[PDB]
Amino acid sequence: SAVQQKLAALEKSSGGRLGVALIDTADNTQVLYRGDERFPMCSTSKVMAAAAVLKQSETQKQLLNQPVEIKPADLVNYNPIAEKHVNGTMTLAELSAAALQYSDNTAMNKLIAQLGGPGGVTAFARAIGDETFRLDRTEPTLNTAIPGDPRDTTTPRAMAQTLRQLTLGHALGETQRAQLVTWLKGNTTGAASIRAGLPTSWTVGDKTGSGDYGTTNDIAVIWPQGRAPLVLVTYFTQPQQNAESRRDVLASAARIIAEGL
Template identity: 35%
Template sequence: MSASRESTFLSRRSVLALGGAAGAAGVVSTVLASAPAWASPLPANGRPVLRADHDRVSDDLRALEVATDVTIGVVALPGGRAADRRSDRRAFRYRAADLFPMCSLFKPLAAAALVRARGYDDAYWSTPIPFTDADVVRDSAVLSTMRPQQATPEQLADAAIRYSDNTAGNLLLRELGGPAAITAFAGELGATHTRLDRWEPDLNEARPGDERDTTTPDDIAALYSALMLEDAAGVLASSRLREWMLRNTTSGARMRAGLTPPYELADKTGGGEYGVVNDAGVLWRPGTEPLTLVILTRTDRPDAVRDNEVVAEVTRLVVGR
């Protein structure tokens, strides 16, 4: 690591040492926000797909993990079919096979499974589904205000994906038969290390070593790219997921904070206990192939706070702005 880069990350570690991991999170965010991004060489069209210097990116991520006391998993896959991307030398992976809490990243899978099963049943998608106060859980900004208490499957998917509404996520799961349906759906698409065991909000517990409700960066990258780029659950499911995820409202401080326009991003965020912050999706830029980007995090500290800037900084380091 060069002297200037080492100095940057040493300053981050110093902040943590002075203020404590949890208490210094806000200060660390400020420090990270001012850190330089080492851009990749530009292709002929003038826009990088992702940084080409993978060893250096891995070094940067290791330094960021030390500075923030956050474990980070990343997969960045340029366009093409999934099988091709897995062997593409341009693809970047860091802790790609490690388990991380999935949190709300299950919600696009639930919506895709429901569209695959009932997508062309117009009456189903426009018929309200009733719910009660007992169904409403925390972090449900959309459904908690609905009067009367009913929502169509269309409204549930929109609330679950665009606003990460937890009650909407649970009602989608109920329509599918429960959390095990997500595990089965992921397995059908070849993601054998993804499992959903609980409902919102318990699935966000993120307790270290607990394999319930976990996935890997490799799995999420394969699932999201297959669903949005390869029509793995059908053309309609791909179209609807893109529509919902392109208009996501929850990633302004995460991936979107690490990107420079122009771009279009179809993504889903997630967050849990132990300071977990996730973001995953597909990135389009003019004149380039799509890039599937997955950033998952975890910690061992029950007092850890969610630091969105970690995800933003990882985006800068991997994509090169």
């Protein structure tokens, strides 16, 4: 199809490996490019950790207000929000927001701890029907993005379906789903990625990811004005360990998808 030829050309021009999955919820049609190949999730995995904590809060009603101490030893490589609260506390809600909207790695590690380890995050994925997602490591080593390594990967198809279920479906309770949507819509790290290839009038909620091998990812829910929402996952990785990020590729892939609608 036209869109798949344009995505292939974009990939060829980029020098890397591009994975795309689009779900149009109007007719549940899907557009896939390398949709069943594994890609390193990097920080896109933070959505799953936050959603797992939200699921816990359906039974533990006060869980998100639980204070969690941030100690100096907790700080890792990228902690824009946690750094502001060293030797103090953040609630689980604040940690979830930080992980999602600022991609805070300390916050992610606290979420993982709350879930009983990476296996607890993976288990949540399995519980909502995602057989592909696997989280194996904590921050920052889950971002190594080594070619061929299946750790800390998923496929575009799987992540699109899971993101749909979490945000537009009913994998979470009503208050929890709404909270997740609010968090994603307030992301601060996404301006140069999917959002940049879409009409400025569309509302987007997204989570970016970055890692070694120039890995540059973004997963989004998109609410076009007067039109069913769309779920779009764009994963990109490159052959050189020290390659630069290529957010423009994700913007271009989004633009190509948007043109075909």
